[PDB]
Amino acid sequence: SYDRAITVFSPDGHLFQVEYAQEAVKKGSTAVGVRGRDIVVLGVEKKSVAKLQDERTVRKICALDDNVCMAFAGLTADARIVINRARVECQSHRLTVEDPVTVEYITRYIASLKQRYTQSNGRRPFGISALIVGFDFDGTPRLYQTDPSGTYHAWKANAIGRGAKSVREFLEKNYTDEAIETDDLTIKLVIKALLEVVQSGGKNIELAVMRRDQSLKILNPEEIEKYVAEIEKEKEENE
Amino acid sequence: FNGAQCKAVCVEAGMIALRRGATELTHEDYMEGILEVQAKKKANLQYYA
Amino acid sequence: NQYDNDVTVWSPQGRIHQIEYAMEAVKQGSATVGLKSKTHAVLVALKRAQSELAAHQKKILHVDNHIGISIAGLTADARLLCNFMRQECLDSRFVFDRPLPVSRLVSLIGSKTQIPTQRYGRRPYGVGLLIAGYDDMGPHIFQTCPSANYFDCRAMSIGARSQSARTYLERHMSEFMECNLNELVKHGLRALRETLPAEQDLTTKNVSIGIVGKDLEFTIYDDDDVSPFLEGLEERPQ
Amino acid sequence: ASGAEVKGVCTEAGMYALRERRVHVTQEDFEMAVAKVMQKDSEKNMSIK
Amino acid sequence: SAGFDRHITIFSPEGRLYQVEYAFKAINQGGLTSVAVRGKDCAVIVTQKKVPDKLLDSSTVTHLFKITENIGCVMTGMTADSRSQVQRARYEAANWKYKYGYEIPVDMLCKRIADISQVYTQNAEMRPLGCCMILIGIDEEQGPQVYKCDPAGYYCGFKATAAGVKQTESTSFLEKKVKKKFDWTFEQTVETAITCLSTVLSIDFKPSEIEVGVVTVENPKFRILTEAEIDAHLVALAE
Amino acid sequence: RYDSRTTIFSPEGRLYQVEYAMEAIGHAGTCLGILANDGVLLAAERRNIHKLLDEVFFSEKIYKLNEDMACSVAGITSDANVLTNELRLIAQRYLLQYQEPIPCEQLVTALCDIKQAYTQFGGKRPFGVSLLYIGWDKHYGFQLYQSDPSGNYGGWKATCIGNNSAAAVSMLKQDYKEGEMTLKSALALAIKVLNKTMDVSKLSAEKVEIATLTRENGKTVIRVLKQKEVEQLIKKHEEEEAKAEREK
Amino acid sequence: GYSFSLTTFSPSGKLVQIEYALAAVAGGAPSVGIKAANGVVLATEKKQKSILYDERSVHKVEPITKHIGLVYSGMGPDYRVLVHRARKLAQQYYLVYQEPIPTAQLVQRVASVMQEYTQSGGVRPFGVSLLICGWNEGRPYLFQSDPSGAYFAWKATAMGKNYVNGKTFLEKRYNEDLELEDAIHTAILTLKESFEGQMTEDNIEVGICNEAGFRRLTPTEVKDYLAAIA
Amino acid sequence: TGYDLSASTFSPDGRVFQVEYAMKAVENSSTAIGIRCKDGVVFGVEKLVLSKLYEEGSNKRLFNVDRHVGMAVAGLLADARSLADIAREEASNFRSNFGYNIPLKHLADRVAMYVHAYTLYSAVRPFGCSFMLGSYSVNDGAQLYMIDPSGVSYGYWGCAIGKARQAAKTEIEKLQMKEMTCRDIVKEVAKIIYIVHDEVKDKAFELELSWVGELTNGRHEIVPKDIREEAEKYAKESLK
Amino acid sequence: YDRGVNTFSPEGRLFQVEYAIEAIKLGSTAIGIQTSEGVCLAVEKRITSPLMEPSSIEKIVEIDAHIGCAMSGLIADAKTLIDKARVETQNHWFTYNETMTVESVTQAVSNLALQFGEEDSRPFGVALLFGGVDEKGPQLFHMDPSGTFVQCDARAIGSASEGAQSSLQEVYHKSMTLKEAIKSSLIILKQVMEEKLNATNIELATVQPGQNFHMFTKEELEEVIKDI
C-alpha cells in the first residue's frame, strides 16, 4: 500500500506502478496497425516536424528481421533499448533453429523480458507497448501487442497512444469482413484510420507497409494526398 | 477474565436460562454465558493448514 | 510502537516482539498432541479443510524410517524444514551409515533457525514441530519454537486451544508410561477430543495417528487403521 | 540587484557622504555602497554548472 | 542545526558532522584518566583502575597493553573497542615485521591505525570505534616518542600527553608545568606524572590503583611496574 | 509527494529526475552549432571569467574526441569528464575492432544507452549533462546532434541549450538560413546570437570560445581558433551594427 | 529535510551534500599558493591548539614526487588517504611510462578518484580541497581541486578562513611576474593578513617548487626569512 | 531514546542503547552463579520447571565446550547455543593448529571479539546472553571468566548472572574461597542457590551443578549430585 | 504498516499473502469438477473487443499429455509457473521414463510458489487448478498463492466464487456422470457471467483415462451449449 514501491500489493489487490506505467503509454503518440489478408500495413501519427532539423532519426517504426515490423508508444528510450535487445534476440534465434523468426516467439521474449524486468528489485518498468506485425507461416498475417505488465495479446487491428478508445472505436465501425485482399481497400482502410486520427493534419501522417514477402516500404506525401482526395470524394458521394 | 467478565457470565447465564424461562439456573446456562463472554471471535483461520 | 517492526531491533524492555508475534502465528495452527511410552512414541494431529468437497490438509508427514514430525504454523517453512530434515537424515545416512540420534538433529534445526532470527532480511520461521524418534536410549518427543529453544518433554501439545490437552497430560502423565500402544493412542485422542468444542464429535476424516516403535517403523495412518483406533471410546461426560 | 537594493545603495552613499561631514555624494560613496550591497552574493569554488 | 537528526555520517549545515564528535565523549563514558610524559630518554605512562570489588581480580584489569616488545600502549573509553583496536595493532605490527624485515617504528603504526579508523569513518554502516589509544616507544636516532590516536583518525604526538575524562585540567596543569625548561631525569618524570594525576584527582592514594607503564633508553623493552617499586616511588615523592 | 528516488514513477506517468536534470542543465554554459556545409562550428560561453586563471588548457568545453569529432558540454562538470573518457574509450574500441572511424550515430546511441542505464537502474544519479556533437562520416557528411539526460537524442541543424538559449533558438528560427555554406556568415550569425543572448556588454573576446571543423583533402581537421580573428570578428560584427544604425 | 542523500537531485538547484562539504572546506585552515614566473610557492597556517604539540610530526606541505608539491585546506585524515592514493597512482604511471607523471595527468586521475567518491550513495565525499603544483616542462603549474571532483588553474589563490579577503589582497598585491623570493614574501604577507599575529618558524610551513625540483623548506631558512620579512 | 534504533548510531550523550537493551534483557533470565576454589571451578544454575511439562534433564544451560571448558549460560537460550557452537569451533581450530589445549584467556578474547563484532554492525543485533567460562590446568590452575553482552571479558573469583546478581554476591564474598576444596564449595553453591527465591514469585526450581578441577583430572562434567546429595540435606538445615 | 514481507502482524500473519488472496478476486472465474469418469473443467474468457481474437487468450494450457491447468489472476506469474511446470514434468519423464503424477506436479510448483525473497522476489498473484489422471484415476487439484495445496472435488475460483461454491454444493454429489457435470458447470457459469453464453465465451477441457489425448472441446461445445 502506496504508489511506492513496485513490490507490495494494494490492500484491495492491485499494483500501483503496473497500473500507473500504462498512463505514460496512454499519454503517448498514436500508432495504429491492421492486418490485411496478404499485405499488412501500419503507421504512426504526430510526426511534428519543428522546421529546423531532420526527422530521419525519430522513426518510430522499424524492424528486427525482414519478416517482422515494429511500433510502440510511451517514452522513446525504453523502446530504443527493447528493440536493440530484440534485434540481438532475433539474431540469436537465427543463430539457433534456422527458421525465419515467428512473431509469437519474439513477442513471448519481449513480454517475458519486460515482466521479469518488472518483478526484480527496484527496476523502473519499460513504459511502452509494442506492436509486432508479421506474416510468417505461409504468409499468415499476425499482429500482437504488448503491455507494461508484459502480456502479449493478439488482435486483428490495433490503436494506442492518445485517444485510443475513439481510434479503436472507428475500427469497430469500419472493420467489416470484406476488408482484404482487396489490397486497395486495405490501403484506403489505413487512409481512413489516418483521417480518423486525433488530429489528422494531413502532412504529419507517416505510414509503412509490408506485403508479407517484400521489405518495409515508406510511402510518399503525394500518394497520401491522393488518398485524402479520394476519401473526401467518397465523403462527397455520401452526400 | 476480570470480575466484570465473570459478572457478565452470571447475568447472561441468567437470561440464557430465561430463554427457556421456566426454571432456575443450569450448568449449560453458565456454559453459554461463557461462550458469549469468551470471544473476541477468531475463526480467521487461513495459511496454518 | 515504532520499534516493533523488525527482528534486529531490541525493545527498550528487551523483549523481541517479532518472536512473540511468531509465537502467536504458531498458536493459530491445528491441534496436535505428542506423547510417548517407554517403548512407543505416538503423535496425533487434527486435520481441517477449506470446504466440504475439499480434502483435508495433512499435518503428520513422513521424514525418515525412525523419525516423523508434526507441524503447526506456516506451510512453506514447513516443507522447507522438511527438505532440510530429510537432507540431514540422508547425509549422515550416507556418511556414517547409521540412523541419527535425534538430539543432534534437533540441535541442527535450532542452529538452522537461529540465523533467520538474528540477521535482517529473513523472517523467523512459524513452526510447530513435534518430533518422535528412536536413538539407542529409546523414544524422544521434542518440540520446537520460532525462538529455536527446542524443548524435550514426555507429553506436549501445541496449536489452538491446546490448554485443555495440557491439563489432560498433567492428569495422565503418571499413567502414560506403562501402558501398551492401544490405550496410549486412545489417551492421545482423549486429549484431542478436548481440543474441540463439545457440540461436535471427532470423526474419521479429520484425524491422523503416527506410531513409531523401538521395533516399529514410522507409519502414518488415515481412517483405515484409524477406524480400528476410533473404536474403544466412550462419549464425553455431558 | 533588486529594486529596493539600489535605493539602499543611494541612501547609504548619502550616509558615506555624511560620515565625511558632507552633503554631496561623489562616486566613491557609490564605490563603497556597491561593496556594501555586494555581500549578497560572492563565494566561488562553486563553478560547477 | 540538527535538525537533520544526525543519524548516519553525512554533512550537516555549517558545516560539521555530529557522529564523530559524539564519539569524542565515548571516551568520556569510560570514567578513566590517562597521562603520558616524555621529557628525556625515558617515557612514562600512568593510569588508575576503578575496582570497587573484592570478588574481582587485579591482574586482568590492566589497561596497559603490550603491543610489541618495544611498543606498549594504554587504553580508555569502552573496553571492547579498545581490545579490538589492540588486536588490530598487534596484527598489523606483525604484518610489518613479516613484510619489511625489521621492527616497526611507532609512528607508522599510528598512521595505520588512523587509516583504519578513517576507513571505518569514510564508509558508513559500521560503528566508528569509540576508544582513544595512546602509544609510547623508543626509536633509534630520535629518542623516545609519545603518540595519541583518535577515534576520529587524527593521530598526533608530543611531549606531555593525556586523554580520558578529566584532561582539560591535566593539559592545563601540564601547560603550567612544562613551560619551565628543567631536565627530566626519570624520577622527575615519575614525580610529575604521579603529582599531576594527584592534583587532577586529589586523592593521594595507595600504590594499588595506578598502573605505570615505562620505557627507557637503557632497555628498550616495554616494562610494567611492580607494587613494591610503585610504593618506593610514591614514598620517594612523599614530602 | 512521490519524490524520493529516481525510480519509480510519479503517478501521471511523469518523471522527477529527468525534469530536474533539465532544470539542472538550464543554469550552465550556452553553446551552439550552425547549419553549414563544407564545415561546421561550435560556440561556447566562458564561465568564471575571473582574472587569476591561466587558460593554458586551450579548451574548456570543447573536447576533440576521436579525430574528426568534438563535443561541447553543459552541466555538472566532473560528470562530463567521466563521460568523455568513456566515450573516447568507446570510439577507440570501435576503431580497434574495425579499423574504421566511428560513423557517429552508433556512438551517440551508445552514450545515450550509457546515460539511460542509469536512468532505469536504482538508486543512481542520472547524468545531469546535455552535450553537443559535431562530426563527419562516410555516409552523411557534416552532422549535428543533441544529447539529453533522458537518453533521447536529437539530430538538429541549429541546436538548443537552456534558459540562456531559448532566445537563441528563437533568433535561430526568425533568422533561419539555408543554402549558404559560407562559414564566415554563420560565424557572424553566431556572433550576433551571443551578442544578444549573452549579457556581456560589447562582447569581450575573453568571454567567448569558438571551435570549427573543416574537411581538408583527407584529414577532417578540427580548428580551435585563436583570439585575434575573434577580435576582428567582433570588429566586423560591430561594423555591421554601424550598418544597422545606418537607418537612423 | 531533503538531500538526503546522494541519489537524487534537488527540486531545482544543486547537490546539498556537496555544498555542505564545500562549507566544511571553507571552514578549514587558511592557506595560499602563488604561481610565479620561475616557481610556485605553497604555504600554510598551522597553529597548535596547546603548547604541548610537536611540529616535527605532522606535515602539511607534502611531496607527491620529487617535483610535485601539494597542500590542502580541510580534514587531515581524508587528506592522507587521497595523498596515499596519489602516491600509488603516480607510481603506477612511473611503472607504465618510466617517466615522471605530469601534474595535469595527476589532476585528471585524482579528480576522477574524488568524483568516484561523490558517486552515489553510500560514502560521504571528502572534506578536502587541494592545491597541486609542480615545475613540469619548464612552465610551472598550479591546480586547485575541490570535493566535487572539479579542478581549476590559478595564478594565485587561497583556501580557508577569510579566503575572500586573501583573494582581494592577492588580486591587489600580486601580479604576473615575480621571483620565487618575492612570491615567498607576498605569500607570507597574505598568510599573516588573516592569521593570528603570533607567527614563528613553526606556525607556518612552506614548500616551494623550483625547476630544480620540489623543495620543502626548513624552520632554519624559515626563521632566516620570516624574521620580520617586512 | 529514539535514537535507540540501530546498533551503529550513537546517542547525543554518547552511548549505545542497543547494547544497554541487550544487557538488561539477561536481567530477567534465571539466576546463574559461579565460584572457584584453590584447585577447581564450580558452576551452579537456578533452573526452573515451567509447570508440569518439563522432564528434568532437558535443555541444560550447563554446556560443555571443550574437554576442560564448559559454559554456564543465562539469557536467550538459542543464542547461547549458537555462541557455544562458535566456542566449540574455535577450540577445535586451536587444537588443530597448535596440538594442545586452548588457554582460557585466548579463548575468551576470541569469543569477546566475536561478541564485539556482533555489536558493531547494524544488520545484526547484539547478543542476549551472559555466561561463564571455567577451566582447570595443571600448569595454569583455575581461571574463571565472565562475558557481558557487550564484549567486556575479564576474570573473577566469583560471579552471579540473573535476577539476584547483587543479592548473591552479597554473600558470595563472605565465603572463605582460597582455603577450601571444591567439594565443600559444592554444598556452598547449593546453599547460595537455595537461599535466593525459595517460593516467592514462582513455584518450583531445580538445581544443576557443573564441576571442573583437580579432582576430575582436567575433566569438566556435571557432578553426580544425587551422589552424596549435598543440597537438600543441607537445604532443610539452611532454612533455620 | 504491514509494509513488507518481513514483518508479522500482532495477531498473525501476512498481510502480503492476504493481499495476494485479495488479488485472486479480480480475475475471471473458472470451474472444474472431478468425476471418476474423468475431470471436466471450464472457464470464462471475458472478451473485450471483436478485434480480440478469442483462441489467442489462454486459460486451459497443456502441461502433460494427461494434465491440464487453469489460471486465475496475474497472467504472467501464471505463465512463469506454467513454464516451470513444463520444464519439470519433462525432467521427471527424463529421469524416470514415466509420467509425473499431478500431486507431485503440484508439490513441485508449490516448492517455489513461496520461495519469495528479495534478499538472501514478491509472492505470486495467481491461484491454479490442476486436472489430470494418475494411476489412481482422475485427479483434480487446487492450489493457491500461499502454496497451501489441497485436493478439491469441485473447486470454483475467482470472481463470484461464493455463490458458485454454494450452488455447486447444492448440485454436487460423489457419483456424478460426465455430461451431467458438464451442463451443471455451464449452468453455474451462465449464472455467474454477465454476457450471453455462446461459443466464444467459455471453453471446456475434458480428460479421460481412455481418452487421454486432446483435453479440449472445439465447436462441439456449441452443441453442448445449445442443449440447454
UniProtKB/Swiss-Prot annotation, chain A:
Induction: Down-regulated by the ribozyme Rz3'X. Up-regulated in colorectal cancer tissues. The lineage of its organism: Eukaryota, Metazoa, Chordata, Craniata, Vertebrata. SUPFAM superfamilies: N-terminal nucleophile aminohydrolases (Ntn hydrolases). The keyword Signal does not apply. The modification Phosphotyrosine is found at Y152. Coiled coil: none annotated. This is Proteasome subunit alpha type-7. One of its GO terms (biological process) is proteasome-mediated ubiquitin-dependent protein catabolic process. Component of the 20S core proteasome complex involved in the proteolytic degradation of most intracellular proteins. This complex plays numerous essential roles within the cell by associating with different regulatory particles. Associated with two 19S regulatory particles, forms the 26S proteasome and thus participates in the ATP-dependent degradation of ubiquitinated proteins. Its main location: cytoplasm.
Curated annotation (Swiss-Prot), chain F:
InterPro entries: Ntn_hydrolases_N, Proteasome_alpha, Proteasome_alpha-type, Proteasome_asu_N, Proteasome_bsu_CS, Proteasome_sua/b. Induction: Down-regulated by antioxidants BO-653 and probucol. The modification N6-acetyllysine is found at K124, K173. GO terms for cellular component: cytoplasm; cytosol; extracellular exosome; intracellular membrane-bounded organelle; nucleoplasm; nucleus; P-body; proteasome complex. The modification Phosphoserine is found at S10, S72, S170. Coiled coil: none annotated. It holds the Pfam family Proteasome. The keyword Nucleus applies. Gene3D superfamilies: Glutamine Phosphoribosylpyrophosphate, subunit 1, domain 1. It is found in: Cytoplasm; Nucleus. Keywords: Acetylation, Cytoplasm, Host-virus interaction, Nucleus, Phosphoprotein, Proteasome. Belongs to the peptidase T1A family. The 26S proteasome consists of a 20S proteasome core and two 19S regulatory subunits. The 20S proteasome core is a barrel-shaped complex made of 28 subunits that are arranged in four stacked rings. The two outer rings are each formed by seven alpha subunits, and the two inner rings are formed by seven beta subunits. The proteolytic activity is exerted by three beta-subunits PSMB5, PSMB6 and PSMB7. (Microbial infection) Interaction with HTLV-1 TAX protein favors NFKB1 activation. This is Proteasome subunit alpha type-4. It comes from Homo sapiens.
UniProtKB/Swiss-Prot annotation, chain G:
Changing L106V: In a colorectal cancer sample; somatic mutation. The gene is PSMA2. Belongs to the peptidase T1A family. Keywords: Acetylation, Cytoplasm, Nucleus, Phosphoprotein, Proteasome. The 26S proteasome consists of a 20S proteasome core and two 19S regulatory subunits. The 20S proteasome core is a barrel-shaped complex made of 28 subunits that are arranged in four stacked rings. The two outer rings are each formed by seven alpha subunits, and the two inner rings are formed by seven beta subunits. The proteolytic activity is exerted by three beta-subunits PSMB5, PSMB6 and PSMB7. The modification Phosphotyrosine is found at Y2, Y20, Y72, Y117. Component of the 20S core proteasome complex involved in the proteolytic degradation of most intracellular proteins. This complex plays numerous essential roles within the cell by associating with different regulatory particles. Associated with two 19S regulatory particles, forms the 26S proteasome and thus participates in the ATP-dependent degradation of ubiquitinated proteins. This is Proteasome subunit alpha type-2. CDD domains: proteasome_alpha_type_2. PROSITE patterns: PROTEASOME_ALPHA_1 (PS00388), PROTEASOME_ALPHA_2 (PS51475). It comes from Homo sapiens (Human). SMART domains: Proteasome_A_N (SM00948). GO terms for cellular component: cytoplasm; cytosol; extracellular exosome; extracellular region; ficolin-1-rich granule lumen; nucleoplasm; nucleus; P-body. The modification Phosphoserine is found at S3, S10, S12. The modification N6-acetyllysine is found at K66, K167.
Curated annotation (Swiss-Prot), chain H:
CDD domains: proteasome_alpha_type_3. The modification Phosphoserine is found at S238. Induction: Down-regulated by antioxidants BO-653 and probucol. Up-regulated by bacterial lipopolysaccharides (LPS) and TNF. SUPFAM superfamilies: N-terminal nucleophile aminohydrolases (Ntn hydrolases). One of its GO terms (biological process) is proteasome-mediated ubiquitin-dependent protein catabolic process. It is found in: Cytoplasm; Nucleus. InterPro entries: Ntn_hydrolases_N (IPR029055), Proteasome_alpha (IPR050115), Proteasome_alpha-type (IPR023332), Proteasome_asu_N (IPR000426), Proteasome_sua/b (IPR001353). One of its GO terms (cellular component) is proteasome core complex, alpha-subunit complex. The modification N6-acetyllysine is found at K52, K201, K225. Keywords: Acetylation, Cytoplasm, Host-virus interaction, Nucleus, Phosphoprotein, Proteasome. Component of the 20S core proteasome complex involved in the proteolytic degradation of most intracellular proteins. This complex plays numerous essential roles within the cell by associating with different regulatory particles. Associated with two 19S regulatory particles, forms the 26S proteasome and thus participates in the ATP-dependent degradation of ubiquitinated proteins. Belongs to the peptidase T1A family. PANTHER family: PROTEASOME SUBUNIT ALPHA/BETA (PTHR11599). This is Proteasome subunit alpha type-3. It comes from Homo sapiens (Human).
